[PDB]
Amino acid sequence: TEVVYRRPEARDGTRVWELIRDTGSLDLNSPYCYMLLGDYFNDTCMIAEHEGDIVGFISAFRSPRNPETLFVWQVAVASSHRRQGIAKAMLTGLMNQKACHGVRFIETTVSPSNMASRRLFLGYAEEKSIPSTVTVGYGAEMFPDGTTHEDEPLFVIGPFFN
Amino acid sequence: TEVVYRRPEARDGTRVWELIRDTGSLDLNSPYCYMLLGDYFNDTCMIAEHEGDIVGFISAFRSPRNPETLFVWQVAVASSHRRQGIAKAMLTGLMNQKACHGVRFIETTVSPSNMASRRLFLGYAEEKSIPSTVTVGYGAEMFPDGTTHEDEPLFVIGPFFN
Ligand code: NA
Ligand code: NA
């Protein structure tokens, strides 16, 4: 049976946090963070559902200083649903949303070992004939001593319209 | 010597995360989250510094659906600097920022056991003669099973201008 796509709600916050946590690899925010996103940012976020389980999430916001830029924060797809095109469908759903009107750039950061995200963003640009630019973003050394976190290179997609 | 107040930067992200973590009580987001706030949201955030240490932080954003409302996310003051008026000075600094122009409401959520925040927001409204309204916000049951998190009642301050 099919995968369903919708805007999240504050009450999804806990299941979103579970998804992110079960991924193992991703930077995990507080459950409250996911509720706020469900509440205040849900016009520019996306959930994927299959047989009533959350199997995908994208969080994004429009940059407050430069609202023509959408920043994509997290992309998560459950293990059990890899390689079925879900990340690509979320991102495409998201850019179709009415709250993405007037956006001319996508901006995001992709960790070295996140190869799905690298593929998603480069492929999105390539399939739509939009420029993509990759530069130094945040360095590993900006992260706290206890952990060992990777670099977060910056990806800018565009200009385009909408 | 005095406490200094400024907008944060992406490179403060790690020290902000340390402050939040050392507080013990607060919902801790990922270091990356604090960097994004330093980067994309810093016009509506605030740092407090004393003898080059971070001793206070406020995070906020303008609601994307209702940009006349500022939502205040986290308020943190280091243990060692309680009861010296820092939270009040941050919040007052923040509302003076040029990116708070045209704001007519403050909205936030305060946990039951966070008595400093309760005092800050109720006192801010009372000192400025602005209405304050308190209602049910997020319930404890919306949080994940493993933890035991409290309610987050909603505080709305206003209308006012600016
Ligand atoms: Na354009
Ligand atoms: Na007003």
PDB file of N, CA and C in Angstrom, chain A residues 54-148:
ATOM      1  N   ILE A  54       4.661   6.933  11.008  1.00  0.00           N
ATOM      2  CA  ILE A  54       5.537   7.971  10.453  1.00  0.00           C
ATOM      3  C   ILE A  54       6.771   7.266   9.897  1.00  0.00           C
ATOM      4  N   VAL A  55       7.001   7.438   8.605  1.00  0.00           N
ATOM      5  CA  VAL A  55       8.212   6.858   7.996  1.00  0.00           C
ATOM      6  C   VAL A  55       9.186   7.902   7.390  1.00  0.00           C
ATOM      7  N   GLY A  56       8.756   9.182   7.342  1.00  0.00           N
ATOM      8  CA  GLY A  56       9.576  10.271   6.865  1.00  0.00           C
ATOM      9  C   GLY A  56       9.238  11.639   7.423  1.00  0.00           C
ATOM     10  N   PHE A  57      10.257  12.487   7.538  1.00  0.00           N
ATOM     11  CA  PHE A  57      10.075  13.845   7.993  1.00  0.00           C
ATOM     12  C   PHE A  57      11.032  14.808   7.301  1.00  0.00           C
ATOM     13  N   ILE A  58      10.533  15.950   6.841  1.00  0.00           N
ATOM     14  CA  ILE A  58      11.402  17.110   6.553  1.00  0.00           C
ATOM     15  C   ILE A  58      10.995  18.315   7.349  1.00  0.00           C
ATOM     16  N   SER A  59      11.990  18.967   7.952  1.00  0.00           N
ATOM     17  CA  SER A  59      11.801  20.256   8.588  1.00  0.00           C
ATOM     18  C   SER A  59      12.449  21.376   7.762  1.00  0.00           C
ATOM     19  N   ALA A  60      11.759  22.511   7.591  1.00  0.00           N
ATOM     20  CA  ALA A  60      12.353  23.620   6.928  1.00  0.00           C
ATOM     21  C   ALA A  60      11.739  24.892   7.417  1.00  0.00           C
ATOM     22  N   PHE A  61      12.420  25.985   7.137  1.00  0.00           N
ATOM     23  CA  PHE A  61      11.868  27.310   7.378  1.00  0.00           C
ATOM     24  C   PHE A  61      12.379  28.292   6.382  1.00  0.00           C
ATOM     25  N   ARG A  62      11.647  29.362   6.185  1.00  0.00           N
ATOM     26  CA  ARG A  62      12.149  30.453   5.402  1.00  0.00           C
ATOM     27  C   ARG A  62      13.026  31.342   6.234  1.00  0.00           C
ATOM     28  N   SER A  63      14.195  31.663   5.693  1.00  0.00           N
ATOM     29  CA  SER A  63      15.141  32.470   6.410  1.00  0.00           C
ATOM     30  C   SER A  63      14.559  33.873   6.810  1.00  0.00           C
ATOM     31  N   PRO A  64      14.565  34.184   8.118  1.00  0.00           N
ATOM     32  CA  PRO A  64      13.980  35.481   8.501  1.00  0.00           C
ATOM     33  C   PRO A  64      14.586  36.753   7.871  1.00  0.00           C
ATOM     34  N   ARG A  65      15.915  36.832   7.815  1.00  0.00           N
ATOM     35  CA  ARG A  65      16.617  37.876   7.037  1.00  0.00           C
ATOM     36  C   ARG A  65      16.402  37.843   5.535  1.00  0.00           C
ATOM     37  N   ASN A  66      16.156  36.685   4.916  1.00  0.00           N
ATOM     38  CA  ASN A  66      16.119  36.527   3.439  1.00  0.00           C
ATOM     39  C   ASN A  66      15.049  35.536   3.126  1.00  0.00           C
ATOM     40  N   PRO A  67      13.794  35.970   3.263  1.00  0.00           N
ATOM     41  CA  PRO A  67      12.650  35.065   3.145  1.00  0.00           C
ATOM     42  C   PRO A  67      12.452  34.433   1.784  1.00  0.00           C
ATOM     43  N   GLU A  68      13.147  34.907   0.750  1.00  0.00           N
ATOM     44  CA  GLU A  68      13.213  34.189  -0.562  1.00  0.00           C
ATOM     45  C   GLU A  68      14.046  32.901  -0.536  1.00  0.00           C
ATOM     46  N   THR A  69      14.737  32.645   0.569  1.00  0.00           N
ATOM     47  CA  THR A  69      15.503  31.406   0.779  1.00  0.00           C
ATOM     48  C   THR A  69      14.809  30.485   1.764  1.00  0.00           C
ATOM     49  N   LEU A  70      14.582  29.257   1.344  1.00  0.00           N
ATOM     50  CA  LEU A  70      14.137  28.213   2.225  1.00  0.00           C
ATOM     51  C   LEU A  70      15.327  27.403   2.685  1.00  0.00           C
ATOM     52  N   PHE A  71      15.483  27.307   3.989  1.00  0.00           N
ATOM     53  CA  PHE A  71      16.452  26.467   4.587  1.00  0.00           C
ATOM     54  C   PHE A  71      15.842  25.145   4.992  1.00  0.00           C
ATOM     55  N   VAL A  72      16.413  24.030   4.529  1.00  0.00           N
ATOM     56  CA  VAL A  72      15.976  22.699   4.866  1.00  0.00           C
ATOM     57  C   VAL A  72      16.913  22.217   5.952  1.00  0.00           C
ATOM     58  N   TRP A  73      16.298  21.965   7.095  1.00  0.00           N
ATOM     59  CA  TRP A  73      16.963  21.568   8.300  1.00  0.00           C
ATOM     60  C   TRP A  73      17.209  20.035   8.362  1.00  0.00           C
ATOM     61  N   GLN A  74      16.214  19.216   8.663  1.00  0.00           N
ATOM     62  CA  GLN A  74      16.380  17.755   8.754  1.00  0.00           C
ATOM     63  C   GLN A  74      15.580  16.999   7.716  1.00  0.00           C
ATOM     64  N   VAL A  75      16.184  15.947   7.188  1.00  0.00           N
ATOM     65  CA  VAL A  75      15.483  14.967   6.340  1.00  0.00           C
ATOM     66  C   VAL A  75      15.717  13.604   6.962  1.00  0.00           C
ATOM     67  N   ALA A  76      14.629  12.880   7.243  1.00  0.00           N
ATOM     68  CA  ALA A  76      14.698  11.546   7.937  1.00  0.00           C
ATOM     69  C   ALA A  76      13.740  10.635   7.234  1.00  0.00           C
ATOM     70  N   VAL A  77      14.197   9.422   6.978  1.00  0.00           N
ATOM     71  CA  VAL A  77      13.405   8.339   6.392  1.00  0.00           C
ATOM     72  C   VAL A  77      13.706   7.103   7.209  1.00  0.00           C
ATOM     73  N   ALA A  78      12.678   6.393   7.668  1.00  0.00           N
ATOM     74  CA  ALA A  78      12.939   5.190   8.514  1.00  0.00           C
ATOM     75  C   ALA A  78      13.709   4.115   7.709  1.00  0.00           C
ATOM     76  N   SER A  79      14.716   3.489   8.326  1.00  0.00           N
ATOM     77  CA  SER A  79      15.419   2.257   7.828  1.00  0.00           C
ATOM     78  C   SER A  79      14.618   1.335   6.942  1.00  0.00           C
ATOM     79  N   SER A  80      13.535   0.867   7.525  1.00  0.00           N
ATOM     80  CA  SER A  80      12.626  -0.004   6.852  1.00  0.00           C
ATOM     81  C   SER A  80      12.051   0.560   5.563  1.00  0.00           C
ATOM     82  N   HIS A  81      12.243   1.839   5.222  1.00  0.00           N
ATOM     83  CA  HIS A  81      11.644   2.401   4.007  1.00  0.00           C
ATOM     84  C   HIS A  81      12.644   3.181   3.128  1.00  0.00           C
ATOM     85  N   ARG A  82      13.933   2.860   3.321  1.00  0.00           N
ATOM     86  CA  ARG A  82      15.014   3.339   2.416  1.00  0.00           C
ATOM     87  C   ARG A  82      14.769   2.983   0.934  1.00  0.00           C
ATOM     88  N   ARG A  83      15.317   3.783   0.021  1.00  0.00           N
ATOM     89  CA  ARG A  83      15.391   3.421  -1.391  1.00  0.00           C
ATOM     90  C   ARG A  83      14.042   3.280  -2.070  1.00  0.00           C
ATOM     91  N   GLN A  84      12.989   3.860  -1.530  1.00  0.00           N
ATOM     92  CA  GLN A  84      11.719   3.819  -2.208  1.00  0.00           C
ATOM     93  C   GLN A  84      11.329   5.189  -2.620  1.00  0.00           C
ATOM     94  N   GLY A  85      12.245   6.172  -2.654  1.00  0.00           N
ATOM     95  CA  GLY A  85      11.897   7.518  -3.230  1.00  0.00           C
ATOM     96  C   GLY A  85      11.148   8.507  -2.274  1.00  0.00           C
ATOM     97  N   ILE A  86      11.091   8.172  -0.978  1.00  0.00           N
ATOM     98  CA  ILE A  86      10.340   8.961   0.010  1.00  0.00           C
ATOM     99  C   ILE A  86      10.936  10.377   0.250  1.00  0.00           C
ATOM    100  N   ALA A  87      12.252  10.455   0.437  1.00  0.00           N
ATOM    101  CA  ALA A  87      12.938  11.732   0.604  1.00  0.00           C
ATOM    102  C   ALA A  87      12.675  12.662  -0.572  1.00  0.00           C
ATOM    103  N   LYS A  88      12.704  12.079  -1.749  1.00  0.00           N
ATOM    104  CA  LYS A  88      12.476  12.862  -2.959  1.00  0.00           C
ATOM    105  C   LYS A  88      11.029  13.345  -3.091  1.00  0.00           C
ATOM    106  N   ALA A  89      10.117  12.460  -2.750  1.00  0.00           N
ATOM    107  CA  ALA A  89       8.683  12.825  -2.713  1.00  0.00           C
ATOM    108  C   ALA A  89       8.384  13.928  -1.608  1.00  0.00           C
ATOM    109  N   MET A  90       8.995  13.801  -0.430  1.00  0.00           N
ATOM    110  CA  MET A  90       8.812  14.872   0.613  1.00  0.00           C
ATOM    111  C   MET A  90       9.291  16.220   0.111  1.00  0.00           C
ATOM    112  N   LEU A  91      10.472  16.201  -0.534  1.00  0.00           N
ATOM    113  CA  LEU A  91      11.124  17.444  -0.869  1.00  0.00           C
ATOM    114  C   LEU A  91      10.324  18.069  -1.958  1.00  0.00           C
ATOM    115  N   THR A  92       9.864  17.231  -2.872  1.00  0.00           N
ATOM    116  CA  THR A  92       8.992  17.703  -3.964  1.00  0.00           C
ATOM    117  C   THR A  92       7.613  18.180  -3.457  1.00  0.00           C
ATOM    118  N   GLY A  93       7.009  17.400  -2.553  1.00  0.00           N
ATOM    119  CA  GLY A  93       5.785  17.876  -1.862  1.00  0.00           C
ATOM    120  C   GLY A  93       5.986  19.253  -1.196  1.00  0.00           C
ATOM    121  N   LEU A  94       7.102  19.375  -0.485  1.00  0.00           N
ATOM    122  CA  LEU A  94       7.401  20.566   0.271  1.00  0.00           C
ATOM    123  C   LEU A  94       7.497  21.784  -0.642  1.00  0.00           C
ATOM    124  N   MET A  95       8.210  21.636  -1.745  1.00  0.00           N
ATOM    125  CA  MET A  95       8.351  22.780  -2.679  1.00  0.00           C
ATOM    126  C   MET A  95       7.066  23.104  -3.418  1.00  0.00           C
ATOM    127  N   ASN A  96       6.124  22.160  -3.440  1.00  0.00           N
ATOM    128  CA  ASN A  96       4.806  22.455  -3.955  1.00  0.00           C
ATOM    129  C   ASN A  96       3.885  23.171  -2.992  1.00  0.00           C
ATOM    130  N   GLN A  97       4.146  23.138  -1.701  1.00  0.00           N
ATOM    131  CA  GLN A  97       3.313  23.815  -0.713  1.00  0.00           C
ATOM    132  C   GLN A  97       3.097  25.297  -0.957  1.00  0.00           C
ATOM    133  N   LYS A  98       1.922  25.770  -0.578  1.00  0.00           N
ATOM    134  CA  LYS A  98       1.573  27.170  -0.799  1.00  0.00           C
ATOM    135  C   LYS A  98       2.485  28.116  -0.023  1.00  0.00           C
ATOM    136  N   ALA A  99       3.042  27.683   1.124  1.00  0.00           N
ATOM    137  CA  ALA A  99       3.983  28.536   1.861  1.00  0.00           C
ATOM    138  C   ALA A  99       5.393  28.646   1.225  1.00  0.00           C
ATOM    139  N   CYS A 100       5.678  27.865   0.158  1.00  0.00           N
ATOM    140  CA  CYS A 100       6.922  28.042  -0.646  1.00  0.00           C
ATOM    141  C   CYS A 100       6.812  28.992  -1.846  1.00  0.00           C
ATOM    142  N   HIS A 101       5.693  29.677  -1.959  1.00  0.00           N
ATOM    143  CA  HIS A 101       5.539  30.710  -2.957  1.00  0.00           C
ATOM    144  C   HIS A 101       6.524  31.844  -2.795  1.00  0.00           C
ATOM    145  N   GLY A 102       7.150  32.198  -3.914  1.00  0.00           N
ATOM    146  CA  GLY A 102       8.167  33.212  -3.950  1.00  0.00           C
ATOM    147  C   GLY A 102       9.576  32.825  -3.536  1.00  0.00           C
ATOM    148  N   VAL A 103       9.780  31.563  -3.197  1.00  0.00           N
ATOM    149  CA  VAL A 103      11.137  31.085  -2.873  1.00  0.00           C
ATOM    150  C   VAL A 103      11.959  30.997  -4.184  1.00  0.00           C
ATOM    151  N   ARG A 104      13.166  31.507  -4.137  1.00  0.00           N
ATOM    152  CA  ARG A 104      14.124  31.529  -5.227  1.00  0.00           C
ATOM    153  C   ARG A 104      15.425  30.691  -4.913  1.00  0.00           C
ATOM    154  N   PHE A 105      15.708  30.336  -3.656  1.00  0.00           N
ATOM    155  CA  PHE A 105      16.831  29.446  -3.281  1.00  0.00           C
ATOM    156  C   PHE A 105      16.408  28.424  -2.222  1.00  0.00           C
ATOM    157  N   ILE A 106      16.985  27.224  -2.304  1.00  0.00           N
ATOM    158  CA  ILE A 106      17.080  26.267  -1.192  1.00  0.00           C
ATOM    159  C   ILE A 106      18.513  26.274  -0.632  1.00  0.00           C
ATOM    160  N   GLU A 107      18.603  26.272   0.679  1.00  0.00           N
ATOM    161  CA  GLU A 107      19.880  26.252   1.356  1.00  0.00           C
ATOM    162  C   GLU A 107      19.771  25.134   2.390  1.00  0.00           C
ATOM    163  N   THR A 108      20.842  24.381   2.524  1.00  0.00           N
ATOM    164  CA  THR A 108      20.937  23.322   3.467  1.00  0.00           C
ATOM    165  C   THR A 108      22.406  22.969   3.734  1.00  0.00           C
ATOM    166  N   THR A 109      22.611  22.045   4.637  1.00  0.00           N
ATOM    167  CA  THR A 109      23.946  21.616   5.076  1.00  0.00           C
ATOM    168  C   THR A 109      23.844  20.089   5.037  1.00  0.00           C
ATOM    169  N   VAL A 110      24.867  19.404   4.522  1.00  0.00           N
ATOM    170  CA  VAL A 110      24.820  17.913   4.426  1.00  0.00           C
ATOM    171  C   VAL A 110      26.120  17.382   5.017  1.00  0.00           C
ATOM    172  N   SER A 111      26.025  16.561   6.049  1.00  0.00           N
ATOM    173  CA  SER A 111      27.201  15.886   6.602  1.00  0.00           C
ATOM    174  C   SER A 111      27.829  14.922   5.564  1.00  0.00           C
ATOM    175  N   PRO A 112      29.143  14.848   5.541  1.00  0.00           N
ATOM    176  CA  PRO A 112      29.913  13.884   4.713  1.00  0.00           C
ATOM    177  C   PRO A 112      29.316  12.498   4.657  1.00  0.00           C
ATOM    178  N   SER A 113      28.989  11.940   5.811  1.00  0.00           N
ATOM    179  CA  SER A 113      28.515  10.533   5.794  1.00  0.00           C
ATOM    180  C   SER A 113      27.020  10.388   5.484  1.00  0.00           C
ATOM    181  N   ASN A 114      26.293  11.488   5.385  1.00  0.00           N
ATOM    182  CA  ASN A 114      24.933  11.410   4.881  1.00  0.00           C
ATOM    183  C   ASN A 114      24.823  11.409   3.339  1.00  0.00           C
ATOM    184  N   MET A 115      24.940  10.227   2.779  1.00  0.00           N
ATOM    185  CA  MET A 115      24.989  10.101   1.342  1.00  0.00           C
ATOM    186  C   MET A 115      23.636  10.195   0.671  1.00  0.00           C
ATOM    187  N   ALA A 116      22.593   9.809   1.399  1.00  0.00           N
ATOM    188  CA  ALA A 116      21.227   9.993   0.886  1.00  0.00           C
ATOM    189  C   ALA A 116      20.903  11.486   0.694  1.00  0.00           C
ATOM    190  N   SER A 117      21.291  12.304   1.668  1.00  0.00           N
ATOM    191  CA  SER A 117      20.985  13.712   1.546  1.00  0.00           C
ATOM    192  C   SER A 117      21.765  14.327   0.380  1.00  0.00           C
ATOM    193  N   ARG A 118      23.048  13.968   0.300  1.00  0.00           N
ATOM    194  CA  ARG A 118      23.901  14.421  -0.841  1.00  0.00           C
ATOM    195  C   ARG A 118      23.231  14.076  -2.177  1.00  0.00           C
ATOM    196  N   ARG A 119      22.824  12.830  -2.316  1.00  0.00           N
ATOM    197  CA  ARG A 119      22.126  12.417  -3.490  1.00  0.00           C
ATOM    198  C   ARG A 119      20.792  13.173  -3.730  1.00  0.00           C
ATOM    199  N   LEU A 120      20.030  13.368  -2.673  1.00  0.00           N
ATOM    200  CA  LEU A 120      18.734  14.081  -2.777  1.00  0.00           C
ATOM    201  C   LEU A 120      18.910  15.487  -3.298  1.00  0.00           C
ATOM    202  N   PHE A 121      19.797  16.253  -2.668  1.00  0.00           N
ATOM    203  CA  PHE A 121      19.846  17.649  -3.025  1.00  0.00           C
ATOM    204  C   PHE A 121      20.496  17.876  -4.416  1.00  0.00           C
ATOM    205  N   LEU A 122      21.592  17.168  -4.690  1.00  0.00           N
ATOM    206  CA  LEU A 122      22.263  17.240  -6.008  1.00  0.00           C
ATOM    207  C   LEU A 122      21.356  16.740  -7.116  1.00  0.00           C
ATOM    208  N   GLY A 123      20.662  15.632  -6.842  1.00  0.00           N
ATOM    209  CA  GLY A 123      19.687  15.110  -7.804  1.00  0.00           C
ATOM    210  C   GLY A 123      18.490  16.004  -8.029  1.00  0.00           C
ATOM    211  N   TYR A 124      18.031  16.648  -6.972  1.00  0.00           N
ATOM    212  CA  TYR A 124      16.881  17.518  -7.159  1.00  0.00           C
ATOM    213  C   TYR A 124      17.247  18.621  -8.142  1.00  0.00           C
ATOM    214  N   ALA A 125      18.408  19.233  -7.926  1.00  0.00           N
ATOM    215  CA  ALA A 125      18.829  20.312  -8.779  1.00  0.00           C
ATOM    216  C   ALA A 125      19.050  19.873 -10.241  1.00  0.00           C
ATOM    217  N   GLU A 126      19.594  18.676 -10.382  1.00  0.00           N
ATOM    218  CA  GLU A 126      19.981  18.146 -11.676  1.00  0.00           C
ATOM    219  C   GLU A 126      18.701  17.809 -12.426  1.00  0.00           C
ATOM    220  N   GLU A 127      17.763  17.136 -11.795  1.00  0.00           N
ATOM    221  CA  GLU A 127      16.459  16.843 -12.440  1.00  0.00           C
ATOM    222  C   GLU A 127      15.640  18.075 -12.830  1.00  0.00           C
ATOM    223  N   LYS A 128      15.733  19.146 -12.074  1.00  0.00           N
ATOM    224  CA  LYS A 128      15.021  20.355 -12.460  1.00  0.00           C
ATOM    225  C   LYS A 128      15.838  21.352 -13.279  1.00  0.00           C
ATOM    226  N   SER A 129      17.085  21.047 -13.642  1.00  0.00           N
ATOM    227  CA  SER A 129      17.941  22.072 -14.313  1.00  0.00           C
ATOM    228  C   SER A 129      18.137  23.383 -13.576  1.00  0.00           C
ATOM    229  N   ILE A 130      18.405  23.287 -12.281  1.00  0.00           N
ATOM    230  CA  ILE A 130      18.616  24.437 -11.420  1.00  0.00           C
ATOM    231  C   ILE A 130      20.078  24.374 -11.019  1.00  0.00           C
ATOM    232  N   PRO A 131      20.767  25.493 -10.940  1.00  0.00           N
ATOM    233  CA  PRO A 131      22.140  25.477 -10.413  1.00  0.00           C
ATOM    234  C   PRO A 131      22.237  25.021  -8.968  1.00  0.00           C
ATOM    235  N   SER A 132      23.369  24.442  -8.636  1.00  0.00           N
ATOM    236  CA  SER A 132      23.703  23.994  -7.312  1.00  0.00           C
ATOM    237  C   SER A 132      25.115  24.453  -7.068  1.00  0.00           C
ATOM    238  N   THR A 133      25.377  24.942  -5.859  1.00  0.00           N
ATOM    239  CA  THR A 133      26.668  25.481  -5.451  1.00  0.00           C
ATOM    240  C   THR A 133      27.001  24.890  -4.090  1.00  0.00           C
ATOM    241  N   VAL A 134      28.184  24.326  -3.953  1.00  0.00           N
ATOM    242  CA  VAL A 134      28.643  23.696  -2.720  1.00  0.00           C
ATOM    243  C   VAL A 134      29.865  24.390  -2.199  1.00  0.00           C
ATOM    244  N   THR A 135      29.867  24.820  -0.937  1.00  0.00           N
ATOM    245  CA  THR A 135      30.992  25.537  -0.324  1.00  0.00           C
ATOM    246  C   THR A 135      31.126  25.081   1.120  1.00  0.00           C
ATOM    247  N   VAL A 136      32.190  25.543   1.761  1.00  0.00           N
ATOM    248  CA  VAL A 136      32.460  25.303   3.169  1.00  0.00           C
ATOM    249  C   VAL A 136      31.275  25.875   3.997  1.00  0.00           C
ATOM    250  N   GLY A 137      30.731  25.119   4.934  1.00  0.00           N
ATOM    251  CA  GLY A 137      29.609  25.620   5.742  1.00  0.00           C
ATOM    252  C   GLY A 137      30.134  25.653   7.174  1.00  0.00           C
ATOM    253  N   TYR A 138      29.712  24.748   8.054  1.00  0.00           N
ATOM    254  CA  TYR A 138      30.220  24.741   9.434  1.00  0.00           C
ATOM    255  C   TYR A 138      31.324  23.679   9.453  1.00  0.00           C
ATOM    256  N   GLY A 139      32.394  23.965  10.167  1.00  0.00           N
ATOM    257  CA  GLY A 139      33.484  22.980  10.358  1.00  0.00           C
ATOM    258  C   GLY A 139      33.268  22.120  11.591  1.00  0.00           C
ATOM    259  N   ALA A 140      33.772  20.874  11.540  1.00  0.00           N
ATOM    260  CA  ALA A 140      33.811  19.953  12.697  1.00  0.00           C
ATOM    261  C   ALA A 140      34.288  20.575  14.037  1.00  0.00           C
ATOM    262  N   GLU A 141      35.225  21.510  13.982  1.00  0.00           N
ATOM    263  CA  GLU A 141      35.837  22.117  15.160  1.00  0.00           C
ATOM    264  C   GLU A 141      34.889  23.080  15.897  1.00  0.00           C
ATOM    265  N   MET A 142      33.841  23.531  15.237  1.00  0.00           N
ATOM    266  CA  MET A 142      32.842  24.354  15.870  1.00  0.00           C
ATOM    267  C   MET A 142      31.939  23.561  16.852  1.00  0.00           C
ATOM    268  N   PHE A 143      31.966  22.229  16.776  1.00  0.00           N
ATOM    269  CA  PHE A 143      31.193  21.343  17.627  1.00  0.00           C
ATOM    270  C   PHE A 143      31.869  21.134  19.014  1.00  0.00           C
ATOM    271  N   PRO A 144      31.111  20.608  19.994  1.00  0.00           N
ATOM    272  CA  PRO A 144      31.634  20.547  21.356  1.00  0.00           C
ATOM    273  C   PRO A 144      32.652  19.447  21.505  1.00  0.00           C
ATOM    274  N   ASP A 145      33.563  19.606  22.469  1.00  0.00           N
ATOM    275  CA  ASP A 145      34.715  18.669  22.673  1.00  0.00           C
ATOM    276  C   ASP A 145      34.355  17.177  22.871  1.00  0.00           C
ATOM    277  N   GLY A 146      33.400  16.898  23.776  1.00  0.00           N
ATOM    278  CA  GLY A 146      32.947  15.513  24.103  1.00  0.00           C
ATOM    279  C   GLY A 146      32.674  14.620  22.899  1.00  0.00           C
ATOM    280  N   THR A 147      31.810  15.092  22.006  1.00  0.00           N
ATOM    281  CA  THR A 147      31.480  14.396  20.747  1.00  0.00           C
ATOM    282  C   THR A 147      32.534  14.599  19.649  1.00  0.00           C
ATOM    283  N   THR A 148      32.424  13.793  18.597  1.00  0.00           N
ATOM    284  CA  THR A 148      33.123  14.045  17.349  1.00  0.00           C
ATOM    285  C   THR A 148      32.049  14.098  16.241  1.00  0.00           C
TER     286      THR A 148
END
